[PDB]
Every structure is written in structure tokens, then in C-alpha cells.
């Protein structure tokens, strides 16, 4: 089940074949189905030929949750083209410091006043989404943008910037094949499925929602981009929901208000930070049929335990096993493997650790080292079973 040496956009080419007609994307002003999301992503690839954007180059996409992004993402994807995508609501010297340090081609705001504020930060070309949008349909009609071309598994596909506002600039850097191969292996813990509906709180211009937009497309899944927060849940048939602290405490809090709750729902996965038991228990109290899954990551490989759903109540220290495929392994101060009850460094090594820091040798080759290993300057242990747990 895991895949190797895989292209982004060939997850979107399969599922546009194998189920053409089932839906993939719904956002507040629409629903596309596979083939709809295929035909759009092909037509903007054609708009990026039309604009001369060329393999390898960088595009910085600011744009809300809605079809349109992730049809930027796929059509840049199917061009070797590098998508750069940032939050909206960055400050004037935190864009330029971002737009410079990707050097990208061009840029793509939410809308007018959006591009406004970026062309005070940019020289580059900065294009509005509803008026390149009007092209794009066009483009679409005409069938343009189904041509292949090269890209390899190798190509970087996506920069993810971490750097705050505060810090000098800094995206990891990240190719298609280690994109790929995360998603289907946070995907064989996890067992997202087709009939899944899965609710997306979670921006696409940050890794956890990037890989929900991912693993949706990998297994034919449909993804929901989004107070009413319950009935929006119920009356969307959603099984799969991403969340983080903060929105689980808003969730248990207004399930209260209502009784008639989210059935559907079988699944909640927390990255981001600990989620308390407090929470956990007043999630499965609200929705009796749905797991709390346990996991942990950085960035700079995107996943690195999952703990397994069947496993829930297990083990309550623990951030859960090594994503299939991966090695976790715990280093002393002079990088000598530690035994299991031993605290050290976690470390990781595997076909998701990422390519480094975008043009950043210097920073890259302190947490990337022999790279190949990866060190995520967070320290833990593993029990003999190879859980993984934080601290000694």
C-alpha cells in the first residue's frame, strides 16, 4: 500500500479515471466531482504554459479554502511547478521577506485589495483569482492543459514555510515522492476510504490540511472545506474531521446545545499539540462512534508516529508508532543508538523525510545530517513494542 517514487498529480489522474463522477470537492459556494476537479486543474496547468511558468519555478498562491486553490495546487503539480502557499492576514514585511525568500514567478492573491496589498511588497506579477479565474474557464472549455509533461518524483512540488514573524525566512522544502509516500503511509494507519466525507476546518496552506486535500485524492474520498459548527457536520454526512485543541473544546462545548449530535462521524486525528483527556472523553461521550487518534510530526518530514486507531485507549503517554515505512531512532549527545527506556534525541530516517530547507544549506544540514537523518531536536523514548513517548 505505500507508494514509491510517486508523482503528486497522478493521485488526482487515477482518481479522475477510476471515479470520475463522485464528488472530491465541496466548498461553501459549490461541489466539484473528480473529473470536474481534473478538468480545472488541467486548464490552469495551461494557463501557467500560457504564462511562461516553467518547470521548477515558484508560484506563491494566498487564497482561502475553496476549489480554486486546489486546483492551483494540482495544475501546478502536473507542470513541475512549485506551489508556495501562504495564510492570509501576513504583515506587509512578513510577505516580502516570504515572496523574496521563494522567488517565485508570480503570485496569486484572494482578490482585488488582496493583490493590492501584495503588489506594495512585490515587483512580481500578482494575479486576483476571480479575474485569472475567467481565463482559466475559457481554458477549460477550449479542453486545454491535458498534455503531460516531464516532471520527476524528485521535483519539489510544495515549500511549507514554518518561519514566524519573527525569524528569518524558512520553508521546507518538499518533492513529490515524499509527498506521495507520506500520505499513503499516514493513510495505511489511518484507513481513510471512499466513502469518507471528510470535514477540513484546517487551511490548505498548511501541511494538515495540504494532506487531507492528499489523502482525500488518494482514496476517492470526498474533502469539505470550511457556531453551527454541529449541524454543518451532521448535515454533511461527515465521517473523517481533523482537529486541533482549541477546536475540539469548541466542539464538546457546543454538542451541548445539541442533542440531535453527528453520528456519522468515526474519526477524529489530532496533530498540532496534546489533546487533554478531558477532551478526549467529552468527544467520545458526544460521539460514541468515533476514535481519538493520537499523533505526531514536524514540517520537516511531515509525520513521524500515529498511534493506531484500534489502540485509542492505549498507552496514554504515548504519540504512537513509526509511520509504516519509517525508522524512529533515539540518539545520545554523541548519536549512538539508545536502548528502549532511554531518553535522547528523536530521530528519523525514511522516504518522507523531506529535502531540506529551501536554499538554506547551512540551517538544512543541522537537522537534516549523513540528508538521510533527520533530527528533530525533540527529545523521548520508545518502550520495547517501538512506541514512541516524550521525555524519559
Known amino acids: 500500500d505505500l507508494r514509491y517514487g510517486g508523482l503528486v498529480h497522478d493521485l488526482l489522474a487515477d482518481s479522475g479515471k477510476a471515479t470520475p463522477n463522485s464528488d472530491a470537492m465541496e466548498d461553501a459556494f459549490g461541489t466539484w466531482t473528480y473529473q470536474e476537479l481534473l478538468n480545472h486543474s488541467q486548464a490552469f496547468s495551461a494557463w501557467l504554459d500560457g504564462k511562461g511558468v516553467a518547470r521548477g519555478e515558484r508560484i506563491v498562491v494566498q487564497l482561502p479554502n475553496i476549489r480554486q486553490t486546489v486546483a492551483v495546487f494540482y495544475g501546478a503539480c502536473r507542470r513541475g511547478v512549485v506551489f508556495v502557499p501562504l495564510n492570509p492576514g501576513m504583515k506587509p514585511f512578513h510577505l516580502r521577506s516570504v515572496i523574496a525568500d521563494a522567488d517565485p514567478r508570480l503570485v496569486i492573491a484572494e482578490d482585488e485589495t488582496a493583490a493590492d496589498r501584495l503588489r506594495d511588497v512585490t515587483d512580481l506579477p500578482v494575479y486576483s483569482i476571480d479575474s485569472l479565474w475567467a481565463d482559466v474557464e475559457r481554458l477549460r472549455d477550449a479542453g ?20 514566524g514573524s519573527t525569524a528569518a525566512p524558512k520553508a521546507v522544502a518538499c518533492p513529490h515522492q515524499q509527498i506521495v509516500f507520506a500520505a499513503s503511509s499516514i493513510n495505511a494507519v489511518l484507513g481513510y476510504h471512499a466513502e469518507d466525507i471528510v470535514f477540513c476546518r484546517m487551511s490548505v496552506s498548511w501541511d ?41 473544546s ?31 472523553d467529552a468527544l467520545r461521550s458526544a460521539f460514541p462512534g468515533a476514535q481519538v487518534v493520537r499523533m505526531y510530526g514536524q514540517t520537516e518530514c511531515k ?20 509511520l509504516p515505512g519509517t525508522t524512529i531512532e533515539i ?62
Open 250 to 280: 469548541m466542539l464538546t462545548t457546543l454538542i451541548r446545545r445539541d442533542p440531535e449530535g453527528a453520528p456519522t462521524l468515526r474519526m477524529f486525528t489530532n496533530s498540532a499539540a496534546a489533546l487533554p483527556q478531558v477532551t478526549i
Open 303 to 322: 509525520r513521524i508516529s500515529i498511534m493506531p486507531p484500534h489502540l485509542e485507549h492505549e498507552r496514554p503517554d504515548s504519540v504512537g508508532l513509526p
Open 144 to 163: 486545454a492543459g491535458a498534455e503531460a509533461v516531464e516532471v520527476s518524483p524528485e521535483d519539489l512540488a510544495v515549500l511549507i514555510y514554518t518561519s
Open 331 to 392: 540518539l545520545d549527545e554523541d548519536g549512538t543508538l539508545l536502548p528502549p527506556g532511554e531518553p535522547g534525541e528523536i530521530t528519523v530516517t525514511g522516504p518522507h523525510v523531506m529535502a531540506g530547507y529551501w536554499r538554506a544549506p547551512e540551517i538544512t544540514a543541522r537537522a537534516y545530517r549523513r540528508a538521510m537523518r533527520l533530527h528533530t531536536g525533540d527529545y523521548g523514548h520508545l518502550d520495547e513494542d517501538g512506541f514512541l513517548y516524550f521525555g524519559g
Open 208 to 248: 494538515f490540511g495540504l494532506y487531507k486535500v492528499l489523502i482525500s485524492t488518494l482514496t476517492g474520498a470526498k474533502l469539505v472545506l470550511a457556531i453551527a459548527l454541529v449541524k454543518s457536520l451532521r448535515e454533511s454526512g461527515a465521517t473523517m474531521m481533523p482537529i486541533v485543541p482549541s477546536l475540539a
